[PDB]
């Protein structure tokens, strides 16, 4: 059982290079290139930009868009929230079937980390409860995207904009609305206290049982009792909707959700005694119940 | 800092479905040849102890249905090389990337594109253990999935998946059909040797930690021979001077001499981690190569 990203081919054919004076990545879908609007900023402009004013000073010819060894001509620009939409003369012949979606906290997605419009790596991320993500992003990584693949449809959910001072990351949906309270300006910004995605830890405990790791099973508890424990350890409260979402794994394993919660209560209170679970010494909360099923 | 796979697009365009009788698995379509595991020609019963030559003689080209998406490829020739089957087909793959076949060394990493019925489902990074197993995520039907590195635009294929051992780890071949390790493609008892920790990789990960701000474990110094006596105690690979030189880039990026990083690692091994973490891990990680640490950092 591994942290597994979706295959990235469909998204690789959509990645392009966008330069204004400052280079980053764009997403080329049909005749539109989506990218973060702060590409129109200088080193100095980033302390507190007036984006509307800044964009007026810019002409299409100030936008160097490259798809591989071919330069694309921009014939129109517009600002939607924190993204720039650059209409180009050519529709992407590699455009997959796609949708834009705004994901919920606790959900996961694959990130295609890109630099200078070229993919360098792919990895699975979770949208944290505080609407950050714990990525691996260097300078130039802005405009890299996060996505899920359902059927043959690519559901784009994330475009990368910034690192916070904690070393975590923040970005928008593909309509340019930030996840969380963040703004695309280089001033101090606080992410809330984070929490552990309880439903995901349980999904991962089920993945452990499915793979032979069973030592942590035992006792029982009620949903309201477990939550009082969860609050102590900074775990998200578990709702009945979460129990139902875990149903499939419960049925594969014969282990009732509230029984697994009992085991998780013991692990939180008593720790791991030095044992491991699927080779990890910590509890993992970036697998959804969906991710575990998809894998097994 | 994360476990990061290569983009899989180039390998996705090479995956096909290979069917022989009731068995179906994945094959790799490069130019006009499809590579796949030879046990595709085995029935349920044959797998205890197949005579692959005898089994393959019973097969003709038309017994091999190869599907690239909705396109059927016609097989015009077949041959066995070690534990892989090479099916010559009528069409060269127009999506063939620049590629090489390589046999990786233990301790090296690669990306796996896990596939079923010739369709990719996921991508993840693996390490070739010192005992020539890998800790993968493979289900039934995943055979013929491949492992690779990408340098520039060249795809270096290094692994094809064949089997799970009963301990749950995985084994397979290079693209010339030679197993990594002592394994054979038969369902009889098979032991992997004692594994060991890839010391140079743990050091590289400690460098990645320092690069990323995690410094609490730094300290003392030691000799290469002194550190190795500890390494031997803790089932760690011995550190050679070639390993020191390979870490040179990270030593220079951080100003920390390799032998100083070794001193800190001895302390971590002798005293454990006291419940602290390093890059968010409560264990020492040994599946990032120096190359992997650089590429990311
Ligand atoms: C776009 O590729 C780039 C990628 C990040 C920089 C390094 N690691 C990254 O993930 N993003 C930016 O350059 C961005 C532009 C702003 C939003 C207009 N700035 C940024 O991320 O600053 C990072 C820093 C230095 O940590 C910081 C400093 C001061 C205030 C904040 Cl909120 C953040
Ligand atoms: C090919 O898709 C398939 C992949 C494995 C099945 C489950 N997880 C896998 O990675 N490989 C095989 O089916 C392989 C075929 C042989 C080599 C001819 N057999 C196999 O993997 O054996 C696994 C098993 C059942 O655990 C076993 C049983 C007895 C002895 C051994 Cl060495 C292995
Ligand atoms: Cl861990």
From Swiss-Prot, chain B:
Active-site residues per Swiss-Prot or TrEMBL entry: 39, 143
Subunit structure: 3CL-PRO exists as monomer and homodimer. Only the homodimer shows catalytic activity. Interacts with host FBXO22; this interaction promotes the proteasomal degradation of nsp5.
Superkingdom of the source species: Viruses
Residue numbers on the Cytoplasmic membrane side: 1-297
Mechanisms controlling activity: Inhibited by pyridone-containing alpha-ketoamides compounds 13a and 13b. In turn, alpha-ketoamide 13b (tert-butyl (1-((S)-1-(((S)-4-(benzylamino)-3,4-dioxo-1-((S)-2-oxopyrrolidin-3-yl)butan-2-yl)amino)-3-cyclopropyl-1-oxopropan-2-yl)-2-oxo-1,2-dihydropyridin-3-yl)carbamate) inhibits SARS-CoV-2 replication in human lung cells. Inhibited ex vivo by michael acceptor inhibitor N3. Inhibited ex vivo by compound 11a and 11b.
Location of cross-link Glycyl lysine isopeptide (Lys-Gly) (interchain with G-Cter in ubiquitin): 3, 88
Gene it is expressed from: rep
Reported impact of residue 88 to R: In strain: Beta/B.1.351
Purpose: Cleaves the C-terminus of replicase polyprotein at 11 sites. Recognizes substrates containing the core sequence [ILMVF]-Q-|-[SGACN]. Cleaves and inactivates human TRMT1, preventing tRNA guanine(26)-dimethylation of tRNAs. May cleave human NLRP1 in lung epithelial cells, thereby activating the NLRP1 inflammasome pathway. May cleave human GSDMD, triggering alternative GSDME-mediated epithelial cell death upon activation of the NLRP1 inflammasome, which may enhance the release interleukins 1B, 6, 16 and 18. Also able to bind an ADP-ribose-1''-phosphate (ADRP).
Name used for this protein in its record: 3C-like proteinase nsp5
Localization of this protein: Host cytoplasm; Host Golgi apparatus; Host nucleus
Domain Peptidase C30, residue spans: 1-297
Catalytically driven reaction(s): TSAVLQ-|-SGFRK-NH2 and SGVTFQ-|-GKFKK the two peptides corresponding to the two self-cleavage sites of the SARS 3C-like proteinase are the two most reactive peptide substrates. The enzyme exhibits a strong preference for substrates containing Gln at P1 position and Leu at P2 position
